[PDB]
Amino acid sequence: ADFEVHMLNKGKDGAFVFEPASLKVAPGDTVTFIPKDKGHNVETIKGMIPDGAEAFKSKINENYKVTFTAPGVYGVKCTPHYGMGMVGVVQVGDAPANLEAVKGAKNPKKAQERLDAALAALGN
Ligand SMILES: [Cu+2]
């Protein structure tokens, strides 16, 4: 299955957001991250990807397709707006085994706020 997540200058949750900020996909599914507004990218957050997963970082303004294979939770950020909380979570599969490692990772306050809310949306 193929999903899309947009990087936006604003949305419902304020400025500098991923929409949706939380998404659950099956292993093997793809997500295309779309900087619909200029000035955004997508990058894995250090400490917030499961075992077997690769870190990734898109170029600013590129639509970036990732095929998620390793089960677990993934925290992602927009590199330039990470300090203003421009983050999202992708959960791949059920019962993510890295949940306690993710929940422990260090983030800017505004990022941590939105990550916690995203994790919670997923029912974690
Ligand atoms: Cu951005």
| Oligomer status | monomer
CATH fold label: Immunoglobulin-like
Strand content: 35-45%
CATH class: Mainly Beta
Apparent shape: globular
Structural class: alpha/beta
Strand order in the largest sheet: 2-1-4-6
CATH superfamily: Cupredoxins -  blue copper proteins
Roughly how many Å apart are the termini?
Answer: 23 Å
PDB class: electron transport
Keywords: Electron transfer, Cupredoxin, electron transport
Assembly: monomeric
Entry title: X-ray crystal structure of Pseudoazurin Met16Phe/Thr36Lys variant
Descriptive overview:
Its main location: periplasm. Keywords: Copper, Electron transport, Metal-binding, Periplasm, Signal, Transport. It is found in: Periplasm. A hairpin with a 2-residue loop joins strand 1 (2-11) and strand 2. The chain has a single domain (1-124), classed as Sandwich (Immunoglobulin-like), CATH 2.60.40. The protein is globular and about 35 Å long. The two termini are 23 Å apart. The strands form two sheets. A four-stranded mixed sheet has the order 2-1-4-6, with no helix packed on it. The protein is an alpha/beta fold and 124 residues long. The longest helix is centred in the C-terminal third of the chain and has 13 residues, at 109-121. It has helices at 99-104, 109-121; strands at 2-11, 14-19, 22-25, 30-35, 43-44, 64-67, 72-77, 87-92. The chain contains two helices and eight strands. 15% of the residues lie in helices and 35% in strands. The structure holds copper (II) ion. Copper (II) ion is lined by residues 7, 16, 39-40, 78, 80-81, 86.
